[PDB]
Write a protein that binds this ligand. Structure first.
Ligand SMILES: *NC(=O)c1ccc(-c2c3ccc(=[N+](C)C)cc-3oc3cc(N(C)C)ccc23)c(C(=O)[O-])c1
Ligand SMILES: *O[C@H]1[C@@H](O)[C@H](n2cnc3c(=O)[nH]c(N)nc32)O[C@@H]1COP(=O)(O)OP(=O)(O)O
Ligand SMILES: *Nc1ccc([N+](=O)[O-])cc1[N+](=O)[O-]
Ligand SMILES: [Mg+2]
Ligand SMILES: [Mg+2]
Length: 101
RNA sequence: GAACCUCCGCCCAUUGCACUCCGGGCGGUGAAGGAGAGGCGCAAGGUUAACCGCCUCAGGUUCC
């Protein structure tokens, strides 16, 4: 019904500072999120449609859940992070589960 | 082995759920001057312009 609240390998963060550059944003996200588990990948775009947002993809769903709870609202580049679970599996995960396309 | 990046900014608009990239406008620096190198296009065309795209490579960084 509301998939953004059902745990997922991938967390969706928005309300990020759009001023920060793509690579710096990716590496700072990794720095703050890697202690919660192994990170398959972190996807950021500076597109009009995708700026201010990032998908952080964990190997273990339990890792996503701990990262979200612990970093909900956390100040990051002067804006409180807003964290959800991704509404659908990231492609790399769909490939693992055998569900891709 | 993989991913991301590789000239420096300003303003306007945007709170947006992607996984092939992709809003608009304006400046500056550098003559060891198209932005790490090569190739190939494309651009440019003299007091000081062009500043881009693709592919390969290199490096930096984060990982496996
Ligand atoms: N090394 C070369 O083969 C070479 C380097 C630089 C120059 C050159 C210019 C070349 C082309 C230009 N336009 C097409 C407008 C302008 C150039 O401007 C300069 C300016 C200066 N200054 C000392 C101010 C030096 C060299 C320039 C060339 C060239 O053929 O002129 C070749
Ligand atoms: O193709 C490289 C890869 O197969 C293996 N290698 C090197 N470093 C690696 C790593 O950090 N992770 C993984 N998974 N695999 C790695 O070695 C091959 C060659 O790499 P080198 O840069 O060492 O090449 P060299 O010519 O020096 O032997
Ligand atoms: N190297 C060089 C310096 C300056 C100029 N110039 O025209 O001013 C030209 C060259 N060149 O190589 O032709
Ligand atoms: Mg260039
Ligand atoms: Mg470049």
């Amino acid at each position: 019904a509301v998939p953004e609240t059902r745990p997922n390998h991938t967390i969706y963060i928005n309300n990020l500072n759009e001023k920060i550059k793509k690579d710096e944003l990716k590496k700072s996200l990794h720095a703050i999120f890697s202690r919660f588990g192994q990170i398959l990948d972190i996807l950021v775009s500076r597109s009009l449609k995708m700026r201010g947002q990032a998908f952080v993809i964990f190997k273990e769903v339990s890792s996503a859940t701990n990262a979200l709870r612990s970093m909900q609202g956390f100040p990051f580049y002067d804006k409180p992070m807003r964290i959800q679970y991704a509404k659908t599996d990231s492609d790399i995960i769909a490939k693992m589960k055998g569900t891709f396309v």
